[PDB]
């Protein structure tokens, strides 16, 4: 049992093709684990008050838009999540919603997201499933409401288990005010459209 100084030598350079083929898949996985821990373990393993303005806010939200209500975009795969988080301008805020169908409190917050997206064109409201992300069983069993926030590729909000602070029958105005408490939400109706070389006009010359 000798030759501890193995010095594999010629071996690698003749096999680095397969090594790099394995390493490409390894890195594709590794970015996925790196991005999927930023909310896990840290908090996952663990009469002016009447607000009469919120009512009129709700009624004006009911008349938000004419064309359509639109639906929150659904992520189909982890790679799609990766390449829409990585893409898009870093100056806009992206928030992601995780859910599993069956638990209470999901449709209400989905409708809140729909309303806010209708009244906030800049935002890019999106939703994901808890099963497609392959999170831990603890997340799937006790962390169903998870509103991740991506502003320039980093969290500025990691709201998990928002049921206690929001209830089970909250509406759009409640979620909007709760998110605006920490300053998460940044601050006319055309006919249909106006947008239609660069030569504009000239005279005689």
């Amino acid at each position: 049992l000798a030759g501890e100084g193995i010095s594999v030598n010629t071996g690698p350079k003749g096999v680095i093709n397969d090594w790099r083929r394995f390493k490409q898949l390894e890195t594709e996985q590794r970015e996925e684990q790196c991005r999927e821990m930023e909310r896990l373990i840290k908090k996952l393993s663990m009469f002016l008050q009447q607000y009469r303005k919120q009512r009129m806010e709700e009624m004006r939200q009911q008349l938000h838009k004419g064309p359509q209500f639109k639906q929150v975009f659904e992520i189909s795969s982890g790679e799609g999540f990766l390449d829409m988080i990585d893409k898009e301008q870093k100056s806009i805020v992206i928030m992601v919603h995780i859910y599993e169908d069956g638990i209470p409190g999901t449709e209400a917050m989905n409708g809140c997201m729909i309303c806010l997206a209708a009244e906030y064109p800049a935002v890019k409201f999106c939703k994901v499933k808890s099963s497609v992300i392959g999170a831990s069983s603890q997340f799937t069993r006790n962390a169903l409401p998870a509103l991740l926030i991506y502003k320039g590729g980093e969290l500025i909000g990691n709201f998990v288990r928002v049921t206690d602070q929001l209830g089970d029958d909250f509406f759009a105005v409640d979620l909007e005010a709760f998110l605006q408490e920490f300053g998460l939400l940044p601050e006319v109706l055309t006919s249909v459209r106006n947008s239609a070389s660069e030569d504009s006009d000239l005279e005689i010359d």
């Binding site: 000798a2 030759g3 501890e4 100084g5 010095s7 690698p12 350079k13």
Partner: protein, 76 residues
């Protein structure tokens, strides 16, 4: 008795220890490996070596200098 070959264990996890014959064997094998590696590049007819870095940059280095060969290797 010896630290390793004692009924009670005195080391942390991963800490090892080599007695006389084993330590001498390890030192001699390491030194002979280094000497055999650096040689064959000695004298007028000595040849050169290719130092293929395993890092991201993958630096390529063709050299005959013994010190450069010895410093650019992973030695345990």
């Amino acid at each position: 008795a010896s630290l390793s070959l004692a009924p009670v264990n005195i080391f942390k996890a991963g800490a090892d220890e080599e007695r006389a014959e084993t330590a001498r064997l390890t030192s001699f094998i390491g030194a002979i490996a280094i000497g055999d590696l650096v040689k064959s590049t000695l004298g007028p007819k000595g040849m050169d070596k290719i130092l293929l870095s395993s890092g991201r940059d993958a630096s390529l280095m063709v050299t005959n200098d013994g010190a450069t060969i010895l410093k650019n290797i992973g030695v345990d």
